[PDB]
Paper text:
Based on these observations, we made H175K mutation on the SUR1-Kir6.2 fusion constructs, in which the C terminus of SUR1 is covalently linked to the N terminus of Kir6.2 by a long linker to ensure the correct 4:4 stoichiometry between Kir6.2 and SUR126, yielding the H175Kcryo-EM construct. Subsequent refinement resolved two 3D classes: one class has a closed and the other has a widened inner helix gate. In contrast, in the structure with widened gate, the inner part of the M2 helix moves outward. While in the pre-open state, the side chains of F60 swing away, which allows the expansion of M2. During channel opening, there is a 6° anti-clockwise rotation of CTD viewing from the intracellular side, resulting in the clash between E51 and the nucleotide-binding pocket in the pre-open state. Although the ion permeation pathway of the pre-open state does not allow the permeation of fully hydrated potassium ions, the hallmarks of KATP channel activation, such as the enlargement of inner helix gate of Kir6.2, the dissociation of inhibitory nucleotide from Kir6.2, the rotation of Kir6.2 CTD, and the binding of activator NN414 and activatory Mg-nucleotides on NBD-dimerized SUR1, all suggest the current pre-open structure represents the “activated” state of KATP.
ATP-sensitive potassium channels (KATP) are metabolic sensors that convert the intracellular ATP/ADP ratio to the excitability of cells. The SUR subunits bind to activating Mg-ADP and drugs, including insulin secretagogues and KATP openers.
Author numbering:
A (entry chain A), D (entry chain C): 32 to 356
B (entry chain B): 1139 to 1286
C (entry chain B): 2 to 275, 281 to 329, 337 to 621
Write the structure that this text describes.
């Protein structure tokens, strides 16, 4: 069966039959940033190279119009000195736009059109420099790479905490640096049908994380076990261990939304769990222990679970057995 | 079809032998076109075999719809079902016609590819023969043989 | 080295002392300018709009509409590409005389060729995305191109180049094409006011392409994909991965639906009446479908005219293998020197062959589409006659249900294949006339003798054709009776086995088949006579020409160019005569089919 | 009637009779960024060109004061070499400020005022470079263009889900890239009058989105149907299908507030629905289906709805009929 979100956070949904193209034409900057790294390197090279070539052709045409390309006669002030071919105009355009200025090839005061083209080339070069350097720095400072160092346990767990049959997870951070105002958004994706007859193919019903204040905020120095208490309001209220095989409609996705402390740009880390990746009657082992003078986190035991005696009844049947007693 | 096939498949091999005699280097360029042709016959023959079969399997409910209409004409006109059966004919005719149209356009696809390969044969043979006659003498008469 | 104008007379071509526009190199660079402008505008817009697609997000326009002058713009772009290829060839030929390489002769034309390809890609992406406001850049480019080329032409007028030089004619043709494309852009602005001038007009896409779920995109694709059948490619791919079914094939377009062609045929028959018979059926088919038949005949006529570009190119190439003006400081090549050449004729032959094959396949497709629409209309009319038929027609032996079903399974197919073969017959005499004229132009009076040898066996050809028509009429007459007897034997096989009468009815079917085989033997004898006559006419004609060209006449030498060009012309002219038996068989099967269709449609009915 | 928010998100409210102008004079950067693209291009050209012209006039006046413009005499060290006219001073000011430095025109050590003007021109050029390039990059990296690729369904819908008569929508994203911490804020704008007699002409009463946790957060990989359950606390509790014509006071606006994953700048997408654009007894069709190996979203059916049997009573009358039964 298809997977809505990969375990590395990749979203497998394909967008097709998009009739509206002018939305992408109005949004050029987002198309430019979201390109792949070879494509952005190609555009970054080609924009500067095309600007140099275009103004080089303008300089070469100006030097042709003034007779500077003709070696006949002499003692005539050229528009730009030492322009003899297209290579001279290309080197001079590179010297102007990158503001190197060797000065063997230099604008003169004889031609006002040379001064106007110099002004236009400087303005266009400043604009291209600003846009391209900002695009490259925004691509390097993207917060998708920070979500790689955020890890999730490979197997979700269902056990009994305070007699409530909670659905537990484990998040973890591989970085010394913190994540500012970290929030956790857990959803259950299925193909739920309303009693009237409406079929939603990827119905996402969010499940509350037991924070303690009724919020989403977490503190992520150490790995945390994130547990959603399965109660009467939970979508997993009828979930059974007779379920949780590979050919089951259930999917549960966890989203860690935070702000990177070092860059200030918000990041999003995603990890989904299929039904066969949710273990019944198992519990995460403790991995944090007191070191020589501090706390040490054993990341080799990050996904490790143990068998724990847990009832095989659903939360409905467990609640009914509790009410009968 | 047998007479047409004999004439075509023997004029082709005669012409390729003639161009190979006057310009042996054409044999070097005879190999990739025979590759390209092969790939075209790889891609067309799977599609056409479907489009022929779908053209035949859409012709059977059309023709049989006539056969039950003529023998059951009194029954169809007694139920006043003339309009319903004419609509059934419109459905069957549209199915058969669009199956035949896709078969036709697949044939035109193949023939456009093959005729462009033939134009490439003329261009390659002309280039080799002209370059020879300007470099290594072909008596200016074998060139006309190869081009013809 | 690699200077834009060659370093001759101490780079005297770079002097602008006489005038800035009076220098050919500067005017060539000014012609370079708009192509660079178009590339540098179009490439980022195209890369952002259509190169930013990813594997996760695919953008597909399932529906599109065509701008005004679409066919004209694609034709003008193709002619522009052809003339720019000729300009590249002329610049290379002119530069080969000089010791140094003058880059201004071919690099502006190559940049123009790249710009024309980029402009047609930009126009197609705009048209399939429906963004008319992005046409402005194209407008600017055409304006710039026209202005620069006009300047070149005016300067060529000021130095008195004249029409003997091919570059002057190519410059004038480029000015004409750029002006026509500018007028096409102005027409697009006028019909669809996308620019800031009143309210723009939305054409809206056609409904069959909009939401009918049709997948036969041939009426809705541009001329390059209409002629090369490019849209079929995906189907040819998907047939590898999944078998083609009646879901992968969509629904018929509204113009190709059976009801539309049936109503058109009914309008034709009503226009005739304001009944039946074979002649009125033929005129009704003419009124309903002859416009499409004329379109296919026009494509076949253009293909026949471009088929003669073969023998003429062979004449020029072999004539050159058997074997000037300085102007504004750069050697010019005349039209006779350009068309003389050898490789130039090979390139022109290759382009003419590509255009001829595209036109011929378009002719075949239009003829076959017309035949399929005719088959739908005729089947609908036959069924509507059946619903209004009387059972007394079948009850008194006037017609049988096998014959009524064979009116669809057999007779409609024969009429359809004759409608396939009609444009070739319509376009054959023009090809014959132009071929005989070109044979006289290459050979002379010897070609008149060879054409007389071809003409002297035309009464024998007509006699054989009439005998073939009579034999095929007898064959159809006996085959219908044989199929009727075979059907009545197969349906009542149990009674024939129980009464042991299987051999008697088998013998009766054998007698009818024996009469059919007698008619088929007469047809095959006259077919063999026709094939031998149409294969010995070229041999005798070629022999009598090439003997009379040297032994009888002494007007010119034989030469390989004249002989092989005339050989190609003779083969091209006698290729349609090879299929005379198939043509006369299809024609007489159509005549029989139309006659019995008229007999069926003029039969008795049920009174209201 | 007037529209408060356009379907593309444009807010049609006009601000007039603003007596306070000094707020705009204190806020120069926001005036500069929020200009139109030709106006920002004009200011970007004119600031650099005016700086070059002003320091060019200063250099020309200095060369005049030193006698460098006089071709009489010789062997005197000028303040700047090769300054002969106003064009020479303009080219030299361009060489200094854009830091090209051809060096045919070069400051000398004879004049201390030339050194002081060089220092002042370099400092002013660095300031103008920083402010102008940052303004142009902040204008290019604006998050208004990302809201163009966020789409909303053209027709809002009202149907029955779990017998509660919900007001449903459909959001959608045309981008592969995600939106970080996306929130949905739905409001109802009318001309509600209090029982005391206070008339609020554009009274905006927000309506809760049925998230499942009582929050606003959504996950926007696939298009979502956003439904507000019309209950007793809803403003649409008395809403009827006898309403929902064009000359009706009702307006419902949906705000999608998110963070662009690729730039980190928060974006806002708006779409309002008038009364005639809310369809009664209709339901959005499913558009997400399992592809060859993943999920595919058919955006050609994005706004498509079908007729569904729904009661023509209001939520008040439906609740009364439920209480009677
Ligand atoms: C097939 C080709 N050669 C050819 N065609 S032909 O017109 O039938 C004829 S007749 C005669 Cl005698 C000698 C020939 N040689 C290459 C055109």
């Amino acid at each position: 069966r298809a997977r809505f979100v990969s375990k590395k956070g990749n979203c497998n949904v394909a967008h097709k039959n998009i009739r509206e193209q002018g939305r992408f034409l109005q949004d050029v900057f987002t198309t430019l940033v979201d390109l792949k790294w070879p494509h952005t390197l190609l555009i970054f090279t080609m924009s500067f190279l095309c600007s140099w070539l275009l103004f080089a052709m303008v300089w070469w045409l100006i030097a042709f119009a003034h007779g500077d390309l003709a070696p006949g006669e002499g003692t005539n002030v050229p528009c730009v000195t030492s322009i003899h071919s297209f290579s001279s105009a290309f080197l001079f355009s590179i010297e102007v736009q990158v503001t190197i200025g060797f000065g063997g090839r230099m604008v003169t005061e004889e031609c006002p059109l040379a001064i106007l083209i110099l002004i236009v080339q400087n303005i266009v070069g400043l604009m291209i420099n600003a846009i391209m350097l900002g695009c490259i720095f925004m691509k390097t400072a993207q917060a998708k790479r920070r979500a790689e160092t955020l890890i999730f346990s490979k197997h979700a767990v269902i056990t009994l905490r305070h007699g409530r049959l909670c659905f537990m997870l484990r998040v973890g951070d591989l970085r010394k640096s913190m994540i500012i105002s970290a929030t956790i958004h857990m959803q259950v994706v299925r193909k739920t049908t309303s009693p009237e007859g409406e079929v939603v193919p990827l119905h996402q019903v969010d499940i509350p994380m037991e924070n303690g204040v009724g919020g989403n905020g977490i503190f992520l120095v150490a790995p945390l076990i994130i547990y959603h208490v399965i109660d009467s309001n939970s979508p997993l209220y009828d979930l059974a261990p007779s379920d949780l095989h590979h050919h089951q409609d259930l999917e549960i996705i966890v989203i860690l939304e935070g702000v990177v402390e070092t860059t200030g740009i918000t990041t999003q880390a995603r990890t989904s769990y299929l039904a066969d990746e949710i273990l019944w009657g198992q519990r995460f082992v403790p991995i944090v222990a007191e070191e020589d003078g501090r706390y040490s986190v054993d990341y080799s035991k990050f996904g490790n679970t143990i068998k724990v005696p847990t009832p095989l009844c659903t939360a409905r049947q467990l609640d009914e057995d509790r009410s009968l007693l | 079809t047998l007479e047409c096939l004999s004439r075509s498949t023997l004029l082709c091999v005669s012409a390729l032998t003639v161009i190979s005699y006057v310009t042996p280097v054409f044999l070097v360029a005879l190999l990739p076109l025979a590759v390209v042709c092969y790939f075209i016959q790889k891609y067309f023959r799977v599609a056409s075999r479907d489009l022929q079969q779908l053209d035949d399997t859409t012709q059977l409910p059309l023709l049989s719809h006539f056969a039950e209409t003529v023998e059951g004409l009194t029954t169809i006109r007694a139920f006043r079902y003339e309009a319903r059966f004419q609509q059934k004919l419109l459905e069957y005719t549209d199915s058969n016609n669009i199956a035949s149209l896709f078969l036709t356009a697949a044939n035109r696809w193949l023939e456009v590819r093959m005729e462009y390969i033939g134009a490439c044969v003329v261009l390659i043979a002309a280039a080799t023969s002209i370059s020879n006659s300007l470099h290594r003498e072909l008596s200016a008469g074998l060139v006309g043989l190869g081009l013809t | 080295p690699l200077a834009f104008c060659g370093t001759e007379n101490h780079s005297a071509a770079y002097r602008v002392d006489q005038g800035v526009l009076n220098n050919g190199c500067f005017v060539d660079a000014l012609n370079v300018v708009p192509h660079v402008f178009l590339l540098f505008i179009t490439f980022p817009i195209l890369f952002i709009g259509w190169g930013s697609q990813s594997s996760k997000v695919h953008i597909h326009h399932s529906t599109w509409l065509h701008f005004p002058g679409h066919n004209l713009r694609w034709i003008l772009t193709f002619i522009l590409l052809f003339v720019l290829v000729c300009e590249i060839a002329e610049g290379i030929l002119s530069d080969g005389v000089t010791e140094s390489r003058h880059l201004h002769l071919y690099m502006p034309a190559g940049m123009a060729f790249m710009a024309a390809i980029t402009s047609v890609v930009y126009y197609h992406n705009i048209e399939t995305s429906n963004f008319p406001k992005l046409l402005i850049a194209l407008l600017i480019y055409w304006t710039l191109a026209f202005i620069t080329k006009t300047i070149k032409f005016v300067k060529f007028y000021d130095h008195a180049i004249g029409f003997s030089q091919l570059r002057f004619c190519l410059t004038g043709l480029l000015v004409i094409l750029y002006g026509m494309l500018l007028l096409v852009e102005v027409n697009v602005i006028r019909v669809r006011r996308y620019i800031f001038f009143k309210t723009p007009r939305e054409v809206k896409p056609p409904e069959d392409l909009q939401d009918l779920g049709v997948r036969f995109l041939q009426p809705f694709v541009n001329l390059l994909s209409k002629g090369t059948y490019w849209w079929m490619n995906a189907f040819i791919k998907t047939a590898h991965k999944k078998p083609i079914d009646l879901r992968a094939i969509g629904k018929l377009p509204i113009a190709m639906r059976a009801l539309t062609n049936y109503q058109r045929l009914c309008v034709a028959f009503d226009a005739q009446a304001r009944p039946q018979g074979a002649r009125a059926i033929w005129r009704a088919l003419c009124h309903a479908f002859g416009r499409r038949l004329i379109l296919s005949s026009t494509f076949r006529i253009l293909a026949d005219l471009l088929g003669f570009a073969g023998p003429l190119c062979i004449f020029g190439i072999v004539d050159h293998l058997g074997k000037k003006t300085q102007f504004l400081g750069v050697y010019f090549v005349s039209s006779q020197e350009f068309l003389g050449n050898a490789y130039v004729l090979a390139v022109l032959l290759f382009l003419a062959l590509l255009l001829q094959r595209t036109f011929l396949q378009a002719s075949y497709y239009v003829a076959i589409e017309t035949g399929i629409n005719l088959r739908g209309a005729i089947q609908t009319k036959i069924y509507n006659k059946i619903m209004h038929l009387s059972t007394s027609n079948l009850s008194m032996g006037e017609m049988t249900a096998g014959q009524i079903c064979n009116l669809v399974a057999i007779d409609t197919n024969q009429l359809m294949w004759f409608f396939f073969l009609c444009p070739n017959l319509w376009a054959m005499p023009v090809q014959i006339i132009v071929g005989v004229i070109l044979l006289y132009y290459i050979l002379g009076v010897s070609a008149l003798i060879g054409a007389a040898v071809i003409i002297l066996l035309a009464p024998v050809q007509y006699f054989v054709a009439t005998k073939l028509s009579q034999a095929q009429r007898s064959t159809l007459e006996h085959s219908n009776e044989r199929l009727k007897q075979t059907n009545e034997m197969l349906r009542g096989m149990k009674l024939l086995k129980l009464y042991a009468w299987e051999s008697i009815f088998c013998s009766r079917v054998e007698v009818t088949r024996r009469k059919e085989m007698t008619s088929l033997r007469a047809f095959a004898v006259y077919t063999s006579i026709s094939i031998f006559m149409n294969t010995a006419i070229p041999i005798a004609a070629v022999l009598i020409t090439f003997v009379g060209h040297v032994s009888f006449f002494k007007e010119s030498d034989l030469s390989p160019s004249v002989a092989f060009a005339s050989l190609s012309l003779f083969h091209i002219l006698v290729t349609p005569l090879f299929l005379l038996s198939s043509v006369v068989r299809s024609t007489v099967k159509a005549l029989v089919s139309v006659q019995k269709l008229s007999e069926f449609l003029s039969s008795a009915e049920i009174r209201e």
